[PDB]
Amino acid sequence: SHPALTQLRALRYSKEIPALDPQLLDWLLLEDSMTKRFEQQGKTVSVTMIREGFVEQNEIPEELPLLPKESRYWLREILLSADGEPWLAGRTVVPVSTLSGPELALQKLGKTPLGRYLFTSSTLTRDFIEIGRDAGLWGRRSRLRLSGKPLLLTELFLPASPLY
Numbered sequence: 001s002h003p004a005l006t007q008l009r010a011l012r013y014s015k016e017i018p019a020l021d022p023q024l025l026d027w028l029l030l031e032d033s034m035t036k037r038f039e040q041q042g043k044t045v046s047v048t049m050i051r052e053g054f055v056e057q058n059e060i061p062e063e064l065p066l067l068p069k070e071s072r073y074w075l076r077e078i079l080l081s082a083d084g085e086p087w088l089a090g091r092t093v094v095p096v097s098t099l100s101g102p103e104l105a106l107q108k109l110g111k112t113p114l115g116r117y118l119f120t121s122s123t124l125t126r127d128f129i130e131i132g133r134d135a136g137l138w139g140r141r142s143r144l145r146l147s148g149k150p151l152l153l154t155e156l157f158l159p160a161s162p163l164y
């Protein structure tokens with residue numbers, strides 16, 4: 001499917017916000033979303049669709065403990081690019097429960113990036129953000145809420161990104 005997404009799922013946690021210079025953290029603990037942030041850096045952001053669709057509990061083992069137990073979840077894997085080069089790998093797990101009312105948009109993203117700057121129709125909350133890493137790269141997972149309805153976001157920062 002994609003080597004970056006394979007790395008992403010290998011991320012390992014122990015939270016601990018990386019003592020590394022507080023300029024790497026401001027990225028890793030960033031609360032506004034990646035896209036606009038990547039754009040500020042002066043570059044066209046674009047989405048590469050790897051796989052989107054409903055999956056059962058046994059296809060989301062790393063996320064399951066952080067979400068409620070439902071019949072299926074909407075899984076979306078994408079790669080995010082800056083002026084053509086991959087800067088990040090993204091994997092979203094959305095309990096079917098969350099896809100109620102205006103949240104059915106989470107299913108119609110296409111090659112359009114996820115949340116906020118159009119999600120000025122809803123109102124998000126953020127339970128947390130914990131840093132992870134593996135094979136030398138940074139990654140973070142966060143549980144977001146739209147009207148209280150949870151979804152899990154995990155990202156991996158790739159070598160070409162404005163972190164390392």
Ligand SMILES: COc1cc(C(=O)[O-])ccc1O
Nearest residue numbers: 034078090091113114153154
């Ligand atoms: C998981 O994080 C990301 C996901 C997506 C997406 O699915 O379109 C876009 C940007 C991200 O930072």
